[PDB]
Design a protein around this ligand. Structure first.
Ligand code: CLA
Ligand code: CLA
Ligand code: CLA
Ligand code: CLA
Ligand code: CLA
Ligand code: CLA
Ligand code: CLA
Ligand code: CLA
Ligand SMILES: CC1=C(/C=C/C(C)=C/C=C/C(C)=C/C=C/C=C(C)/C=C/C=C(C)/C=C/C2=C(C)CCCC2(C)C)C(C)(C)CCC1
Ligand SMILES: CC1=C(C/C=C(\C)CCC[C@H](C)CCC[C@H](C)CCCC(C)C)C(=O)c2ccccc2C1=O
Ligand code: SF4
Ligand code: SF4
Ligand code: SF4
Lengths: 33, 40, 161, 143, 80, 741, 65, 137
């Protein structure tokens, strides 16, 4: 099928990259005032 | 020789070396005279 | 007979091993000429190999399917010489060594300079302790009965529990 | 004749005023690079940096890529450059988000608005530079 | 920052203060010891935790004791 | 004025301080209270600078210790010569060198170890040797065993003389610090007197005893009919029959008609076709020219007479704009501190040992040593290991100098001060170099492995997919091959056949062959560069940050070797220069191991082998290096797994000792990891439990047992690690090469 | 306990816990831990003496006569 | 508090100095007096010349300042060293000889901080202070 081509890059490159970006930004968020 | 040299020979490493050389000689000569003894 | 093993006297694999070792030496023997030191030394080697195999056969060792002696250590006196007799011999020798060490430590502590007595051995009395340790099983029993083998329990440091 | 002296006449700062660090050539080149040039807005700095990097990013992928010995070598190289530029500008945006959390000044690389403008310029410049390099390599027969 | 404590087994030897490389410790008057002084840690925030005080302490177990805790720039000893 | 001044009877000869073990150290002189005292005794045994404070006494101790070392070395040379004389087949090997395997050790028959007395040929049974001493003696001209016996006795006499000299120069007539600090006179005597006259005497020995005997042996005269050296020395008629120029005497020397000696003083180059080694006439000319060079060199420095240089002024005159005061103060540093001298000398000794390894394989100097493949591999690997060890000793003693003998008063603004003032820049740039070099060099291998596993050989960094050719190495090889015609007209052949030219072969085996360089050689050379750079990073950081660092401003106060400075600042573990040396020893071990593996595989695949009459060249492994050395999988399969067969299959044969040592070295290497990973606190608590068990039976010792110190645990782990690794490689190489070659 | 006597330590945290030691000095007045017990067995730091309280010591052998 | 115009030791510069954190979080200063101009070793790598009379030096760590003070005390016998912490606001806090004498000497004006009234091995167990914000000391 075409689901492997559609999903493997989506879930192994785009999603983990966005997760790393989100985690980095969140850990670098400073205290509220 | 003297009390000093006897004390030095009585020091720990010299005595260990002499005693273990004697033990190794005893084992080696026992092996020579009763070779290949797998059991009593 | 135990565990399906058989004596090494009637062991075809054991005999084959003996012949293989003999044939290997006799082959290596071809390089050297008669009467040389190497030739006579190899003749000693062959004689010792044959003597070892004959002695192993005569001693009653059990040979397995691989054609090598197998030692039975369970307590049967048919095979006492394998473990029981060497075991008691080692136990006696090891207790001799430990008793000589312990008795020398007991002496050396009473001395004015125990720290220097440990690294510079008083050999005249140390040899005495080595000799006197021959009767250690009776000496150990006597000291145990007299309460001098064990230090009581609350005289020995112990860490915070 | 000393040639290594304290940095800004400060012996206790962790630096030295060597010829490499402080010479007129170094000062001129660094101060005239876009990131340090005077009067350039953050958008202009980002734009210059973007085209400069996107022009050369295509080449490694084009020549040494898996499809180097393929009719679509240059197209694959350009797509690889575009993907790398996407990753780079995502890195820029998250860096701005993490560093310049609270800011209201603007017009400065060390502020949120200025860094956003710099990232925008970098993205546009890099895409344009990669496209221009693609066009040049297609028409390499000119040179 | 680390927590520096001094217990009443002190004997006023003033060697912990000498071993101290950050001026965390000082001698203050005391009644219990014959020397009339006891170590104290009024500047525990400057402590780094190398435990040279503990190394230099001659009591059977340490009259001066350092418990590592929250890390800071000073405690980590970062020049940057 | 340079003069001899000594103190008469400075020390009494007595055993009282033999009885007193820790007499030398102030702390250990009191006596033992824990087992750490025992370890500290050996650790501080030879630390004279810590033991005393007088440079005069330190120098006297060092001088007599050198005499003791010379005595040991003479005993070692005596063992070599005597075992050759008595327990060796040297006569049979001399009669037939190609067929007979050299052997000079015999094991007694005790526990069946007589199997190790393998068949080495010539009606002799023993352990095959790989030291090359047989070829050494053949070059020297020894043809009988009486000569070996008598030189062994002479070596024993020299060893006794060295022991006597060491006793005399400490207990009867010890020199002064003023005598010791005459560095100019020392350099003059060591250049002109030691090296110059040593080369001159060796050249004379060669010209008079080695050229005739070796030429007759190569012609075919058996050793029994060779004229004896005492006959050859003065019989000018026989020397003229052999080399016609000898009939002209020494007049062509005293007059400058030196060309008349062209027959026995040649510049042929290449290798002798008969023995497959360097020409001994070339060697004699070489040593004579070096004797002239060193005698000329040794008249440079000033002494009692006006003529001469002074190293103080030579150093002080060399200063530039980017260096401030320049080399001012280094003369004082190197005259006052023994550790600085030890550092420089160890660095040069180690690099020189590595150069010796690289030169001896490429230009086999001794006859029939090239075909003796075990000897070449053994000597190369041995000298590489010794070189690495010496270089790390150099780094360690440089660090010791920095900790102890450094002082800003003498080095204000000199090169040492200027280097310390930007150590951060130095180390950061070397760090970047290391990361870049390692990333690229090892990523070539990892990329190749990944592409091969993915079934994409066309994407590899191979000789036929993406070539990384060593253009500069190939260019240098081409220049060296063309040198004998253009740039070295008087040389008939190349310096080495590795660069190019013919394939030298003796009987079937190949002595030397051109070594071709390609992608695999590029990769492995850059791996070598990366390993050297990381080792230099570790050692140089240890030396530079010995005084202090951003983490510990007062690191010098703690000492040279100290465990740590506590868990503060996040942890200050292994901050010491000693610990930097401890870490760098692992890295030189890795470097030298990779170098010797590269040497072994490259030579078995591409040089060593046999050549047939038709010209077919068949190598040991079959030239698989060029295609299998591109991947770590190929390194693991075609070198380690493939060549471990001769080791693992050695049981029941003469190489069974090599198999046993292989397993034992693996065991010791594994054992070392216990010390390397574990920590002292666990072992101290375990020892507390065991001490309770002993106290229960009233036998706890007065010398309380303790876990080893942290520095000692690191040292023990490192020593066991190095011993296990070097022993594993030793057994593997020796078994493989003895079996196949 | 007394000068010249042998006393067994009872402080749980001491290296010489439940070991004998010779009393060398008893301080009067202040000195929360007035007894000064000297040992022949060095601790890990290396010191062979330490101060102890009255209740931390147990009398086992009176001084000589 | 501090003059900020004292002549500093003669030094040719080094890379061991403060790097972008002393000027934004906190710097340290140490001022002393020397009887003769003389060469000493910086806590950072290098050799400087302390001037005759007053001398002022900048550093990045209280540990570095204390190390230099110890060096001055046990080599040149200079015990007039005083150490300050300089904030980016230019506030100066005089730190090391706080009472005017070193910590080793006893003074009556010092109050005990972190002093416990029992032996070390009488602290409460962790189970006692479990689920509580206090600690066992
Ligand atoms: C934990 C179980 C598990 C695992 C390890 C995998 C593994 C795989 N799946 Mg997936 N898959 C699963 C369950 C799982 N699947 C389930 C239940 C479904 C729904 C029917 C699918 C539907 C599915 C499809 C349709 C396809 C794959 C494919 C793949 C492969 C590529 C990865 C990808 O992007 O797919 C992920 C795709 C999904 C739809 C995932 C759905 C969500 C799962 C259940 C999440 C599991 C989370 C786990 C329990 C906790 C994570 C903990 C964290 C700390 C890491 C890979 C072998 C592709 C393939 O065959 O390539 C050759 C493909 O085309 N999977
Ligand atoms: C701790 C384990 C262990 C044990 C139980 C044994 C037991 C034995 N070994 Mg040893 N051996 C050991 C470790 C051990 N070995 C190790 C580590 C090595 C390597 C160096 C050897 C290498 C070795 C050899 C090479 C030989 C022995 C032999 C022997 C036998 C000695 C009997 C003898 O001659 O008494 C005689 C006593 C009197 C007459 C009294 C005995 C069966 C010898 C033998 O005959 O084996 C069958 C023999 O040849 N051992
Ligand atoms: C693992 C448990 C175990 C233990 C503790 C023992 C203990 C003993 N067995 Mg053994 N034994 C065992 C398992 C065990 N056996 C098994 C499974 C078998 C069956 C194969 C035997 C078969 C066996 C025999 C045939 C004999 C012993 C004997 C002995 C005694 C040897 C005394 C000596 O030589 O000194 C001793 C009480 C000997 C005995 O009974 O001596 C009085 C004896 O002759 N045992
Ligand atoms: C570090 C070593 C190394 C090297 C040299 C290469 C090289 C290559 N790999 Mg890679 N590879 C490596 C490690 C390495 N690999 C490892 C460890 C793995 C395992 C994960 C792989 C796995 C792998 C795969 C699976 C594939 C490759 C492929 C490639 C090729 C193209 C990659 C690409 O698009 O790069 C893009 C690179 C860049 C965009 C930039 C590179 C850096 C620039 C040039 C540096 C310039 C610095 C400059 C001088 C600084 C100063 C400037 C100033 C003075 C102005 C190329 C031959 C592909 C191929 O087709 O191979 C033939 C491929 O399919 N590799
Ligand atoms: C021509 C004169 C001469 C010669 C031949 C030597 C030879 C030697 N000196 Mg030197 N030395 C000389 C003059 C000379 N010295 C002078 C004038 C001084 C005073 C300034 C010194 C001061 C000196 C010191 C302080 C030391 C040496 C040492 C050595 C040895 C270096 C190691 C070596 O290569 O051993 C090669 C060995 C041989 C060739 C065997 C022959 C040995 C003798 C000569 C017989 C070597 C034996 C070192 C040594 O070993 O000290 C004991 C050493 O530490 N020398
Ligand atoms: C220290 C080294 C050394 C020593 C001890 C000798 C010793 C000797 N050489 Mg000389 N020789 C040497 C180096 C040495 N040589 C070198 C380097 C060369 C090459 C230039 C020569 C070339 C040479 C020749 C050509 C001859 C000698 C000869 C001699 C004899 C000297 C006769 C005399 O004193 O009048 C004697 C056997 C003569 C002799 O007796 O030859 C057999 C002779 O004819 N030598
Ligand atoms: C010219 C050579 C030379 C000289 C004269 C010295 C001299 C010195 N070194 Mg050493 N050193 C050398 C080479 C040299 N080193 C090399 C090559 C290295 C690199 C590994 C080092 C690394 C080094 C360090 C890191 C240190 C020293 C230290 C010292 C000092 C004390 C050494 C001592 O007392 O050891 C006495 C002897 C021993 C303790 C025995 C050592 C045993 C070794 C580790 C194992 C031997 C294994 C054996 C060969 C094989 C076993 C086989 C097995 C099957 C049984 C002393 C000034 C120490 C110091 O404080 O310096 C001021 C110190 O910390 N050195
Ligand atoms: C295989 C084991 C191993 C590995 C991988 C490393 C790796 C490293 N050690 Mg070493 N080290 C080892 C064992 C190892 N060590 C052991 C056993 C010890 C104890 C003795 C040490 C002790 C030690 C010290 C004391 C030091 C090092 C240093 C280094 C670094 C050298 C610089 C370099 O080339 O970095 C580059 C990285 C590598 C060579 C690893 C493989 C790289 C591949 C090709 C990938 C690279 C491309 C890319 C970035 C990543 C891949 C893709 C990924 C995202 C999936 C590096 C990180 C030195 C250092 O830090 O120098 C700066 C240093 O000071 N090591
Ligand atoms: C300094 C120096 C150097 C270096 C150099 C370099 C670094 C270079 C680079 C270069 C480069 C790297 C270049 C680049 C260029 C680029 C370009 C030329 C671009 C263009 C672009 C464009 C034109 C664009 C457009 C656009 C846009 C903007 C957007 C939208 C789209 C479009 C397309 C429209 C060397 C080493 C030699 C040495 C000497 C000195
Ligand atoms: C195993 C191990 C120990 C335990 C080792 C100890 C306590 C020392 C062992 C030395 C022995 C006693 C050497 C001699 C061994 C002989 C086989 C013993 C028989 C001879 C007696 C007469 C002494 C440590 O103490 C240690 C400390 C720090 C880091 C790692 C480690 C570590 O790995
Ligand atoms: S026991 Fe420790 S805290 Fe008390 S005086 Fe001694 S060193 Fe200072
Ligand atoms: S932990 Fe460090 S800084 Fe704190 S008192 Fe102890 S030695 Fe001083
Ligand atoms: S394990 Fe050793 S080196 Fe590491 S922090 Fe603890 S004491 Fe320091």
């Amino acid at each position: 099928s075409f689901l492997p081509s559609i999903l493997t890059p989506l879930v192994t490159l785009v999603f983990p990259g966005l997760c790393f970006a989100l985690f980095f930004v969140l850990i670098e968020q400073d205290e509220i005032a | 020789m003297s009390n000093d040299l006897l004390k030095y020979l009585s020091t720990a490493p010299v005595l260990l070396t002499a005693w273990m050389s004697i033990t190794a000689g005893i084992i080696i000569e026992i092996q020579r005279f009763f070779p290949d003894s797998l059991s009593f | 007979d135990v565990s399906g093993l058989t004596p090494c006297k009637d062991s075809a694999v054991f005999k084959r091993r003996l012949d293989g070792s003999v044939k290997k030496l006799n082959s290596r023997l071809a390089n050297y000429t008669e009467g040389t030191p190497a030739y006579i030394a190899l003749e000693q080697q062959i004689e010792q190999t044959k003597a070892r195999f004959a002695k192993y056969g005569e001693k009653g060792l059990l040979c397995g399917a691989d054609g090598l002696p197998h030692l039975i250590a369970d307590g049967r006196l048919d095979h006492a010489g394998e473990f029981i007799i060497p075991g008691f011999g080692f136990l006696y020798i090891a207790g001799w060594i430990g008793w000589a060490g312990r008795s020398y430590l007991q002496f050396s502590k009473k001395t004015d300079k125990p720290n220097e007595n440990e690294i510079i051995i008083n050999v005249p009395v140390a040899l005495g302790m080595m000799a006197g340790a021959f009767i250690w099983p009776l000496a150990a029993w006597k000291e145990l009965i007299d309460g001098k083998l064990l230090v009581p329990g609350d005289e020995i440091t112990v860490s915070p529990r | 004749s000393e040639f290594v002296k304290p940095f800004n006449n400060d012996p206790f700062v962790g630096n030295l005023s060597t010829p490499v660090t402080t010479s007129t050539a170094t000062k001129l080149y660094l101060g005239n690079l876009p990131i340090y040039r005077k009067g350039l807005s953050p958008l202009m700095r980002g734009l210059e940096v973007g085209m400069a990097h996107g022009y050369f990013l295509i080449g490694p992928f084009y020549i040494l890529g898996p499809l180097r010995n393929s009719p679509n070598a240059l197209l694959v190289g350009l797509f690889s450059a575009y993907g790398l530029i996407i990753i780079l500008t995502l890195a820029l945006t998250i860096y701005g988000l993490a560093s310049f959390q609270d800011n209201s000044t603007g017009s400065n690389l060390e502020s949120s608005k200025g860094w956003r403008s710099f990232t925008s310029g970098f993205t546009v410049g890099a895409l344009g530079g990669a496209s221009v390099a693609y066009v040049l390599l297609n028409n390499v027969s000119f040179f | 920052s680390h927590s520096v404590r001094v217990y009443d087994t002190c004997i006023g030897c003033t060697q912990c203060v000498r071993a101290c490389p950050c001026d965390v410790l000082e001698m203050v008057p005391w009644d219990g010891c014959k020397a009339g002084q006891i170590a104290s840690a009024p500047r525990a925030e400057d402590c780094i935790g190398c435990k040279r005080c503990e190394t230099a302490c001659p009591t059977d177990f340490l009259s001066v004791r350092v418990y590592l805790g929250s890390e800071t720039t000073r405690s980590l000893g970062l020049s940057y | 004025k340079v003069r001899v001044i000594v103190d008469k009877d400075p020390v009494a000869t007595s055993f009282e301080k033999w009885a007193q073990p820790g007499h030398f150290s102030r702390t250990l002189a009191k006596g033992p209270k824990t087992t750490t005292w025992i370890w500290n005794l050996h650790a501080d045994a030879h630390d004279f600078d810590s033991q005393t404070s007088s440079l005069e006494d330190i120098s006297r101790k060092i001088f007599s210790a050198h005499f003791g070392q010379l005595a040991i070395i003479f005993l070692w040379v005596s063992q070599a010569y005597f075992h050759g004389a008595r327990f060796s087949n040297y006569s049979a090997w001399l009669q037939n060198p190609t067929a007979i395997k050299p052997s000079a050790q015999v094991v007694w028959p005790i526990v069946g170890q007589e199997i190790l007395n393998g068949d080495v040929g010539g009606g002799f049974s023993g352990v095959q040797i790989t030291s090359g001493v047989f070829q050494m003696w053949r070059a020297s001209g020894i043809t009988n065993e009486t000569e070996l016996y008598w030189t062994a006795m002479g070596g024993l006499v020299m060893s006794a003389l060295m022991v006597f000299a060491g006793w005399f120069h400490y207990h009867k007539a010890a020199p002064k610090l003023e005598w010791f600090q005459n560095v100019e006179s020392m350099m003059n005597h060591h250049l002109a007197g030691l090296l110059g006259l040593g080369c001159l005497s060796w050249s004379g020995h060669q010209i008079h005893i080695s050229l005739p005997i070796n030429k007759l042996l190569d012609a075919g005269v058996a050793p029994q009919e060779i004229p004896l050296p005492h006959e050859l020395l003065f019989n000018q008629d026989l020397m003229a029959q052999l080399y016609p120029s000898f009939k002209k005497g020494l007049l062509p020397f005293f007059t400058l008609n030196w060309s008349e000696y062209s027959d026995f003083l040649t510049f042929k180059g290449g290798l002798n076709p008969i023995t497959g080694s360097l020409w001994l006439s070339d060697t004699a000319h070489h040593h004579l020219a070096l004797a002239v060079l060193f005698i000329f060199a040794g008249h440079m420095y000033r002494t009692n007479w006006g003529i001469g240089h002074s190293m103080k002024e030579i150093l002080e005159a060399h200063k530039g704009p980017l260096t401030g005061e320049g080399h001012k103060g280094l003369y004082e540093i190197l005259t006052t501190s023994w550790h600085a001298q030890l550092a420089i000398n160890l660095a040069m000794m180690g690099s020189l040992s590595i150069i010796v390894a690289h030169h001896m394989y490429a230009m086999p100097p001794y006859p029939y040593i090239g075909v003796d493949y075990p000897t070449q591999l053994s000597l190369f690997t041995h000298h590489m290991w010794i070189g690495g060890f010496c270089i790390c000793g150099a780094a360690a003693h440089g660090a010791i100098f920095m900790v102890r003998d450094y002082s800003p008063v003498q080095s204000y603004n000199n090169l040492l001060d200027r280097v310390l003032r930007h150590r951060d820049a130095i180390i950061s740039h070397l760090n970047w170099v290391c990361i870049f070099l390692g990333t690229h060099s090892f990523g070539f291998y990892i990329h190749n492995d990944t592409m091969r596993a993915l079934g994409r050989p066309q994407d590899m960094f191979s000789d036929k997919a993406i070539q990384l050719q060593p253009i500069f190495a190939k260019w240098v090889q081409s220049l060296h091959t063309l040198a004998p015609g253009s740039t070295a007209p008087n040389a008939l052949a190349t310096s080495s056949y590795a660069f190019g030219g013919d394939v030298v072969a003796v009987n079937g085996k190949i002595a030397m062959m051109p070594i071709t360089l390609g992608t695999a050689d590029f990769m492995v050379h850059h791996i070598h560069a990366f390993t050297i750079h990381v080792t230099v990073l570790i050692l140089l950081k240890g030396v530079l940050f010995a005084r202090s660092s951003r983490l510990i401003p007062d690191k010098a106060n703690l000492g040279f070797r100290f465990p740590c400075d506590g868990p503060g600042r996040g942890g200050t573990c292994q901050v010491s220069a000693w610990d930097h040396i401890f870490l760098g020893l692992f890295w030189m071990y890795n470097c030298i191991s990779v170098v010797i593996f590269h040497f072994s595989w490259k030579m078995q695949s591409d040089v060593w082998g046999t050549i047939s009459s038709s010209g077919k060249i068949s190598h040991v492994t079959g030239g698989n290096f060029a295609n299998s050395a591109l991947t770590i999988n190929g390194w693991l399969r075609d070198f380690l797994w493939s060549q471990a067969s001769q080791v693992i299959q050695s049981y029941g044969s003469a190489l069974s000792a090599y198999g046993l040592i292989f397993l034992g070295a693996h065991f010791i290497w594994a054992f070392s990891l216990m010390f390397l990973f574990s920590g002292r606190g666990y072992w101290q608590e375990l020892i507390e439990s065991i001490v309770w068990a002993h106290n229960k039976l009233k036998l706890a010792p007065a010398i309380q047992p303790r876990a080893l110190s942290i520095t000692q645990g690191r040292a023990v782990g490192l020593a066991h690690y190095l011993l296990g690794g070097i022993g594993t490689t030793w057994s593997f190489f020796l078994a493989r090469i003895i079996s196949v070659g | 306990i007394s000068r010249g006597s042998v006393v067994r330590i009872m402080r749980p945290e001491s290296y010489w816990f439940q070991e004998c030691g010779s009393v060398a000095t008893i301080a009067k007045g202040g000195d929360r831990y007035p007894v000064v017990v000297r040992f022949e067995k060095v601790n890990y730091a290396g010191v062979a003496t330490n101060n102890f309280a009255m209740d931390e010591l147990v009398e086992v052998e009176a001084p000589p006569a | 508090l501090l003059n900020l115009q004292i002549p500093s030791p003669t030094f040719g510069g080094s890379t061991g100095g403060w790097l972008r954190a002393a000027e934004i979080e906190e710097k340290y200063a140490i001022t002393w007096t020397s009887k003769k101009e003389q060469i000493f070793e910086m806590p950072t790598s290098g050799a400087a010349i302390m001037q005759k009379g007053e001398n002022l030096l900048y550093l990045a760590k209280k540990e570095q300042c204390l190390a230099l003070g110890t060096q001055l005390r046990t080599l040149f016998k200079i015990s007039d060293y005083k150490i300050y912490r300089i904030f980016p606001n230019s506030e100066v806090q005089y730190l090391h000889p706080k009472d005017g004498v070193f910590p080793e000497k006893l003074n009556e004006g010092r109050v005990g901080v972190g002093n416990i009234g029992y032996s070390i091995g009488k602290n409460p167990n962790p189970v006692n202070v479990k689920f509580t914000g206090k600690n066992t000391f």
